[PDB]
Amino acid sequence: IFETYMSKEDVSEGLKRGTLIQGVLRINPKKFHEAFIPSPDGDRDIFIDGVVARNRALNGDLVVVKLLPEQRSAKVVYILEKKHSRAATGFLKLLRKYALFSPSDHRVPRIYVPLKDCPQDFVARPKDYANTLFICRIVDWKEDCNFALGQLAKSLGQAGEIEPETEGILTEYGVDFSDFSSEVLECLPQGLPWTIPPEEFSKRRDLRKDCIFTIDPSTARDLDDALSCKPLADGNFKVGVHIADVSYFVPEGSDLDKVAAERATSVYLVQKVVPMLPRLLCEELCSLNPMSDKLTFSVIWTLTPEGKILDEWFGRTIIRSCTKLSYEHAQSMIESPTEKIPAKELPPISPEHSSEEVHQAVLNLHGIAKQLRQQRFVDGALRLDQLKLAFTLDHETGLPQGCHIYEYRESNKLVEEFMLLANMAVAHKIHRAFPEQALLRRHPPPQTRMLSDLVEFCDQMGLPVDFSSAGALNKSLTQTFGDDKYSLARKEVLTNMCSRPMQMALYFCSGLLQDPAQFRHYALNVPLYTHFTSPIRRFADVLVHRLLAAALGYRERLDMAPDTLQKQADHCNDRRMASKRVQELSTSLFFAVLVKESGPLESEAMVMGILKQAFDVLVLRYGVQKRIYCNALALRSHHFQKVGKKPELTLVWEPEDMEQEPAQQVITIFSLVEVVLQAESTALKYSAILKR
RNA sequence: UCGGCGCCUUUCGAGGCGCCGUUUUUUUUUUUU
């Protein structure tokens, strides 16, 4: 039996007086008996122990708590906002009136389902339904039942496959993967051979004779932006960034606008993509495909060879892109400055231009982008880059064949510098035009509480890093380690440790925050930032397109209050967090399937934590973090000692032959060991075990 | 996250309830998909 909720008037009175504390619940995944909310006063979190103490609140709910008398313990007494999807994936068992549902997630409780929802052959023959995934939605949880009451949605398929588990994590996280109704496709233009209307040749600047190109990955269906560079007659360059004009095709108030607003970010998975607009807009009219006339919104600068701004112009234009490069052709043209590249390895080009113009254009943009990068990192930019893996999937069956490591070459930096310049320029324009309403991004500084713990950790172990600032933090991590096999692994382990206390970046509206100190982006060390570029994938990028066209005098001022923009910003934030979690879980699923169907995988590892009877490794080749126990090891003994706050584990192994003396192994932090990954009898679980 | 012990339900694939002994949760920024 749980405890009943309280009235709304008492909640409001105690929340305005200050006796009750609101906050977002966070639930430990590894152990499900404890939860934490952030304190408003100080840094350290408020403890909520047990399952009874938190009244029917799931992970992510925005709850209202009351502190227990005598780090600080509280109990949930009200729920303002229900932010959890109230859905789960799991298995059904015949415990009569009900049937039991056990979710895979251990934070979701156990669910009673009536036998009308259960299938027709479950009551007598339930043995074939012990490996079959079901989706169940909680509709009611009583105050006297330890089990929620649920409605069974459907049958996914066999557990351990690719598509049942994919649809399970999409439904559990709230991603709407359904189809578009006919009232949404009726707002699209109805002319299949679409052409530019002749009244749009006077309000826009015509750039159909320039050399404009796109650099995007080989597996790309939507192209948002294009670049151009031109050498001037006094040793300067005219650099232009061109973005697809999406807000011309999405009118305000139409059903397309509400549907696009409902799912803010597109979701990218390993095998497919859940879009935000219909296929017609995303892959035909809006996308900047080669040799077609497109309506764009563009920014043009005049830059010195070191990359300093002398002129600036915003405005609506009409372009025609000439080629579509990749991140691999651009790297070839970067790495071959004095030698002509043969036409066999190049994508097709419009006959108006030559490949020499594209070649010298990407060379000049590389020359400017190098100096912009160096100056930005002298000024104090911070960059904690971890390890990401990419898969090769078989075409017919859809199973993974092998994983490799995604490498950040120079062509990924060429684009990243010009996009960072266009975003900061547009942020300055729409902030000085409309101070009351503007959409901007902010990153708070990291938490002082566990930055002090990382400082006292690196005070030991002979590491001279410093965490006083952001540029100091980046220059210290780059200079101390250097380049070596043991050193690069040291860098990876410290990047994983340093990436832990950083906070998360937020969208916000400028009419609610009072001081300009909080408008600052911490990691990039700039005072204003906004996402003007790439609109097809995000909806805040279309809100910024409307604001900038109102500021330039092309239309009337926006009629939205400063609170409506804040509500839309909160929706875009939660959609971007759920999308990020979904992509991480999809990569983890495909790796577990690869380990099971590719035998044992042999690699090296670096210890990053040591406990009394177990230790955590980080597999260097794959980047996954697994825990190793001594019980699965054929060893005579192991001893744990603490020497100068530097733990030590000594393993005395068992000799295969009695005559040969038993070897010894000493394990401390930053030690290189060898591990093997082996699948086990459960469908999607594996383990890592030490070798020799 | 477990280690040990006791009990119950199994189609042997394992689950669930207690008693001790452990250990208080944060994985972020950038660009293109």
Author numbering: 49 to 118, 230 to 254, 263 to 859
Sentences from the paper on this structure:
Dis3-like 2 (Dis3L2) is a 3′–5′ exoribonuclease that plays a critical role in human development. Dis3L2 independently degrades structured substrates, including coding and noncoding 3′ uridylated RNAs. Unlike a number of structurally similar homologs, Dis3L2 can degrade structured RNAs independent of external helicase activity. We determined the structures of an RNase R/II family nuclease bound to a series of structured RNA substrates and analyzed the kinetic profiles of wild-type Homo sapiens Dis3L2 (HsDis3L2) and engineered mutants to reveal how this nuclease achieves highly efficient degradation of structured RNA.
To examine the structural changes occurring upon substrate processing, we shortened the 3′ overhang to 12 uridines and further modified the stem to increase stability (hairpinC–U12). We obtained a 3.1 Å structure of wild-type HsDis3L2 with hairpinC–U12 in which the double-helical stem of the RNA hairpin is clearly visible and nestled between the two CSDs and the S1 domain. The overall conformation of Dis3L2 does not change compared with the hairpinA–GCU14 or RNA-free Dis3L2 (RMSD = 0.56 and 0.61 Å, calculated over all Cα pairs, respectively). The basal junction of the hairpin interacts with the S1 and CSD1 domains, while the apical loop interacts with CSD2. At this point, when the 3′ overhang is 12 nucleotides long, the 5′ end at the double strand–single strand junction moves toward a loop in CSD1 (N76–H81). While the true start of the duplex (C2–G21) lies slightly closer to the S1 domain, the U1 5′ overhang forms a wobble base pair with U23 near the N76–H81 loop in CSD1. We observe a steeper decline in the koff starting around 11 nucleotides, which could reflect additional stabilizing interactions that become available when the phosphate backbone of the double-helical portion of the substrate is brought into contact with the enzyme (as was observed in the hairpinC–U12 and hairpinD–U7 structures). When the overhang is shortened to 11 or 12 nucleotides, the RNA duplex engages with the enzyme, stabilized by contacts with the S1 domain and CSDs.
